A paper describes a structure:
We describe the development of a biologic that takes advantage of the proximity of the N-terminus of bound [name] to the three-fold symmetry axis of the spike protein to create an ultrapotent, trivalent [name] entry antagonist. Therefore, we sought trimeric scaffolds to fuse three [name] moieties and leverage the inherent symmetry of the spike trimer to maximize avidity. Thus, we determined a trimeric antagonist fused to the N-terminus of [name] would require a short peptide linker and would be less likely to form inter-spike interactions. The collagen VIII trimerization domain is significantly larger than the collagen XVIII domain (44.7 kDa and 19.3 kDa, respectively), but more importantly, previous studies reported that collagen VIII melts at ~45 °C66, whereas the collagen XVIII domain melts at ~85 °C (vide infra). Given these observations, the smaller, more thermally stable collagen XVIII trimerization domain was advanced to develop the trimeric antagonist.
Next, variable lengths of glycine-serine peptide linkers (0, 1, 3, 5, 18 amino acids) were tested to bridge the trimerization domain and [name] domains. To simplify the nomenclature, we refer to these constructs as TXA, where ‘T’ indicates the collagen XVIII trimerization domain, ‘X’ refers to the number of residues in the linker, and ‘A’ refers to [name]. Analysis of the other complexes, both with longer (5 and 18 amino acids) and shorter (“zero” amino acids) linker lengths, was conducted to better understand the role of the linker with respect to the symmetry of the trimeric antagonist. Notably, we did not observe discernible density for the collagen XVIII trimerization domains of the longer linker length constructs (T5A or [name]), whereas we did observe clear density connecting the trimerization domain and [name] in the zero-linker length, T0A. We then attempted to evaluate the ‘symmetry of interaction’ between our [name] constructs with spike protein (T0A-S, T3A-S, T5A-S, and [name]-S; where S is the [name]-[name]-2 spike [name] protein) by likening the C3 symmetry to an equilateral triangle with all sides being equal length and a corresponding standard deviation between these lengths of zero (s.d. = 0). Thus, we calculated lengths (distances) and corresponding standard deviations between the Cα atoms of equivalent residues in the RBDs of the spike protein (residue D428; as determined by Fan et al.) and in each of the [name] domains (residue N137; arbitrarily determined residue on [name]) (red and black dashed lines, respectively). The calculated mean distances and s.d. between spike RBD were: 41 ± 3.6 Å for T0A-S; 40 ± 1.0 Å for T3A-S; 40 ± 1.0 Å for T5A-S; and 42 ± 3.2 Å for [name]-S. Equating lower s.d. values to symmetry, we determine T3A and T5A to have higher symmetry than T0A or [name].
Residue numbers in the entry:
A (entry chain D): 165 to 172, 186 to 245, 263 to 347
B (entry chain F): 348 to 595
C (entry chain E): 19 to 248, 251 to 615
Write the structure that this text describes.
Amino acid sequence: NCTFEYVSFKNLREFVFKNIDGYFKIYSKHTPINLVRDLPQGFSALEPLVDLPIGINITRFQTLLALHAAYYVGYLQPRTFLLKYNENGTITDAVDCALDPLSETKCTLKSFTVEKGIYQTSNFRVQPTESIVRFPNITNLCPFGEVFNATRF
Amino acid sequence: ASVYAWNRKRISNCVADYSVLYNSASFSTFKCYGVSPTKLNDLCFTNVYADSFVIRGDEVRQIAPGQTGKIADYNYKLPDDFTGCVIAWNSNNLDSKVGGNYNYLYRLFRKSNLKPFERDISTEIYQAGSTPCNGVEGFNCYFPLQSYGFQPTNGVGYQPYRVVVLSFELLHAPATVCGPKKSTNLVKNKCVNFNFNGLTGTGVLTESNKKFLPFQQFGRDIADTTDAVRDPQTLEILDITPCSFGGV
Amino acid sequence: STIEEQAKTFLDKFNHEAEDLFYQSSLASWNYNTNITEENVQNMNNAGDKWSAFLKEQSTLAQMYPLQEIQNLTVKLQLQALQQNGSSVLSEDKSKRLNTILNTMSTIYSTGKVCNPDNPQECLLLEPGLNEIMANSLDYNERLWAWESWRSEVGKQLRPLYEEYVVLKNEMARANHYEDYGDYWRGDYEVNGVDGYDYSRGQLIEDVEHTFEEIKPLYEHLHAYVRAKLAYPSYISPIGCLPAHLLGDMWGRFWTNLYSLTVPFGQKPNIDVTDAMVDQAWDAQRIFKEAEKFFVSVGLPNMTQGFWENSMLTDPGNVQKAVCHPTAWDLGKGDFRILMCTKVTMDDFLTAHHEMGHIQYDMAYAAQPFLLRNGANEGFHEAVGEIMSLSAATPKHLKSIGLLSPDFQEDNETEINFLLKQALTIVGTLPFTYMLEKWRWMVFKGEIPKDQWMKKWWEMKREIVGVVEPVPHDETYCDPASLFHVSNDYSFIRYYTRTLYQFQFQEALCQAAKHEGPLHKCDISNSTEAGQKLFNMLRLGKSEPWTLALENVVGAKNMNVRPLLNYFEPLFTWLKDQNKNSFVGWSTDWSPYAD
Ligand SMILES: *[C@@H]1O[C@H](CO)[C@@H](O[C@@H]2O[C@H](CO)[C@@H](O)[C@H](O)[C@H]2NC(C)=O)[C@H](O)[C@H]1NC(C)=O
Ligand SMILES: *[C@@H]1O[C@H](CO)[C@@H](O[C@@H]2O[C@H](CO)[C@@H](O)[C@H](O)[C@H]2NC(C)=O)[C@H](O)[C@H]1NC(C)=O
Ligand SMILES: *[C@@H]1O[C@H](CO)[C@@H](O)[C@H](O)[C@H]1NC(C)=O
Ligand SMILES: *[C@@H]1O[C@H](CO)[C@@H](O)[C@H](O)[C@H]1NC(C)=O
């Protein structure tokens, strides 16, 4: 059954895939690179390419190759971020709040640069390790057993 | 297509303009069930199922929710909660000829009725009585399909009528087949209630200077309010000023 | 499951196959009748053989269905109309003998050629030779010679063949649970299983006899007036009957040829809009368009365009030969055409309107299954055609469409001439139809001995019709078989029944149209109520008993000539006034051959 169809190292192609509200969205970025082992330690943006009103409950994936290298796969967490839009709206830098306390300070101060000082970020809270229910004794049992163990009925 | 072998086409990921068809004025029947033809023109759907076939004139009324008859039971059935439309136009010059247009067939016998959106192609010899058919016609054994008789002389209820059922699907997936979204010429340097793909702002539009990104649609201010809009018709940015006002 | 459901499904499949097969046969017949070629005859034979084989196979496969356990009226009617074996009820030898005798007698009638003793080579057929001789020429000797030769060289040959055909028909009707083949033909009007509408075969005889008895005074006065007018005083006694050959035809069926000899007022011009039609440049297409406009005016739906693109209205040149006989082709599967060689005449105007009424009736019951896509009986469709032609023949209709100029006046003398001509056309053959049908009934049932057959005929000819043979004929003659229907196995009561039906329908329409004045001046133009009332029975066709349709139209479930009496009441009074000095009736004893 077909319900949809569409047709459109020296280089690194990066992609982000996510399904939200039945819309599958892909954000791509092709960049020139000069390295062969690991991801460059720099910064770049990802702009959207395709959104599809498919909503197929996608849970698994696998890459496809043609038989006549290496690649990297991460995962996405629901994090809070701060982004620095430049003069013409190009994402120049970003900070993840959950990374470390300094990052949390940057997030809560709305600035990539934080003036020297003391700053409150959150409120440490100790959650209940478990729950305990306490009641008096249950000694006062009703004569259900006598009906159960009734010799004469 | 034949009515028992009605052709289903799935339509999605495109703008559907029902206005031209509803206003083409070349059709015998136009019955949109549950939705006005003009209203559905400005309406979106995930899928459109076009079921095309040819029936007699008297069979056209059989193509409706909650209807009976040989066509409505053995050839094709419409659900009671039918939200689409039924369109029908004569094809006497198209699907009839002198001598009889016999290519079309209609199912007349079946062991049971048809489910909604169900197509029956089985040619099993229907057994009216108890005599086994054994693949051939005899006593109490007759072919489920009868050839349509279409000639340019036939009566109004007997002419070949092409009927397409447009069933509209709004499933969990987001809507794909929508309407033209009738655009309007825009103005500038004037207090105008503007709408750009749902922004529905109000104010004055002026020529902008800032440059958007190719994937970008509209701007925003530090206070998180709409300030700039790229025109969807032609790719250029326009600044937005709120409608002039003040104290007196 | 049940036998009734299996029979219904079998009838449905039979209709499915019959649609295509009969459509192919009808299109081949139309091609042959528009172009007479050898290949047309070949495909005619192929289609006829295929259709006959299919009908016989379906009849055999349906006869095993018992009709007594079937409660559906329409299904039972379809099964009884399909299972009618007919002549096949006999053995193959007897059936083929009957078919050969029928073919031989039809060939003798069609090729009946008489030669004058003056020139043995100079021979003429009945049509157009003898019919014109005894219809236009007024020479007593020539008409007598033509009549005697036609009944001699054909009757003598046909008498043994006709006797054998009669006995074979009687034995097959007996094998078909009929007392005689006359009862077999009367079974067409038979209605069973309907409360308050059942009709019996003997009821047909009773109704025909009663209607003829009612017409007897009017026919006696008309015969007296015609005899007084007749042209041939020496050979026609004023008290005696009329010669058979001096009635405009061999059998005296139609006396319209005597109209010139029996015109009430010769100085009064006859109503004919042919000259104005020529002035208005009306042709076959224009006449058909005006007729369609008239049919729409009464409320009937607009007629199809495939008719115009397929039907033949004029003579298709001379390269191809086409049948000029007026026919309304109901080819099936919605195919309706009219085959005519239409000229610019008022007669062709009326004939085209008659054929279009036929086509409207055919398309009315087109929604019925194949077995029910026919008229109620042999006299229903012709009644509709005749009433449509008569409505088209009214002076009001002609004046409304401009064919008859407004300055034309309608006087009593012109009305009397029109009524008398209509009488000679219609009621002239009613006594002849009654007597011939009674003779056929008695011949099939066997009351009339062979050595008395002709002796019986000329008896009632002098009594029922007041017609006397100019020269005596013995039993070697087969004068009844000299007619088309007797020599071709066709029921002759159909004309009397269709006359009664058309009079009843015309009177009912005029009552529904609220006509003011004489019945012969009644025009149903611009009367939607009359058209709707007619359609209420046209669509039924034969899906319902004809008695029910007759009740729905005229309020009477049975035949009656009261509409005929209303139509001819001015003419009846005029004839009674004229016959004050002319003996009314006839004398059976007197004959031209006895002095
Ligand atoms: C717009 O983004 C680009 C990417 O860094 C830069 O473009 C410069 O500025 C304008 C375009 O806005 C143009 O003169 C050139 O595209 C760039 N300048 C020069 C001298 O080449 C810049 O960062 C952004 N634009 C501005 C004005 O800052
Ligand atoms: C939508 O259609 C309009 C009408 O053609 C387009 O306007 C023209 O577009 C072409 C090329 O796209 C230009 O060469 C013309 O100059 C445009 N017309 C005018 C008056 O300027 C419009 O471009 C289309 N929309 C998009 C996004 O291409
Ligand atoms: C996706 O899965 C959820 C539960 O896991 C279910 O409720 C929903 O109907 C599914 N939708 C589709 C389109 O598979
Ligand atoms: C009676 O009480 C004893 C107490 O342990 C229990 O084990 C036994 O199942 C009871 N039997 C009945 C019949 O009540």
